[PDB]
Amino acid sequence: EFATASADYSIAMKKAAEITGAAESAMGPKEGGFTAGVPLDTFTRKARIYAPARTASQSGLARTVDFATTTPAWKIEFEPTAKWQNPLMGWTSSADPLENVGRSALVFYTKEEAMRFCEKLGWEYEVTEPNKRRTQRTKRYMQYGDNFGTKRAGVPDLSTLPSN
């Protein structure tokens, strides 16, 4: 039996990505940036390929690499450039064109897909593998019954009993 998110339109998205002839499209390095038509100094900047960790404030795991095959979780991020305050109002000003484009719009299923996008666009990239969660609990409090075990204070000595 096979049932891996088999009740939604994502079935019709996984295929249409493996249609023959279109599943083997490939370009040389930096070639997609030449035909993109954006200024060429944009590709002198550095990019980071990484999957963001779970927020500490909440316990849910949906925006992590646990659901990597279900949901795109890998991101492309750029270093910050200068910001200052507006003299009249105090609003935060910037001259960065890539200020929100990687964090809002570019999401990928795997690390290699984001690498392929960076390679064909000409961005130099560094890849950061996320830290793997550990599921095995401690030896103490491994199960619920270890809360009430004999490991709290040892086996009780029967020396204060009447008739000792």
**Which parts of this chain interact with other proteins (CB under 8 A)?**
1, 3, 55, 57-62, 66-67, 70, 88-91, 133-137, 141-163
To other proteins, the closest distance from the beta carbon of 151 in angstroms equals: 8
To other proteins, the closest distance from the beta carbon of 104 in angstroms equals: 14
Q: Which is nearer to other proteins, 22 or 139 (CB)?
A: 139
To other proteins, the closest distance from the beta carbon of 149 in angstroms equals: 5
Q: Which is nearer to other proteins, 131 or 135 (CB)?
A: 135
Q: What is the DSSP letter of 12?
A: H
The three-class DSSP label of residue 111 is helix
To other proteins, the closest distance from the beta carbon of 112 in angstroms equals: 21
The three-class DSSP label of residue 38 is coil
Q: Which is nearer to other proteins, 28 or 156 (CB)?
A: 156
How far apart, in Å, are the Cα atoms of 98 and each of 69, 79, 84, 106, 114? 27, 9, 17, 12, 17
Amino acid present at 94: S
Q: Which is nearer to other proteins, 3 or 13 (CB)?
A: 3
Q: What is the DSSP letter of 146?
A: G
To other proteins, the closest distance from the beta carbon of 153 in angstroms equals: 4
How far apart, in Å, are the Cα atoms of 100 and each of 41, 51, 77? 18, 17, 9
Look-up of token digits 């500490």: 56
Q: Which is nearer to other proteins, 9 or 144 (CB)?
A: 144
Q: Are 93 and 53 in contact (CB under 8 A)?
A: no
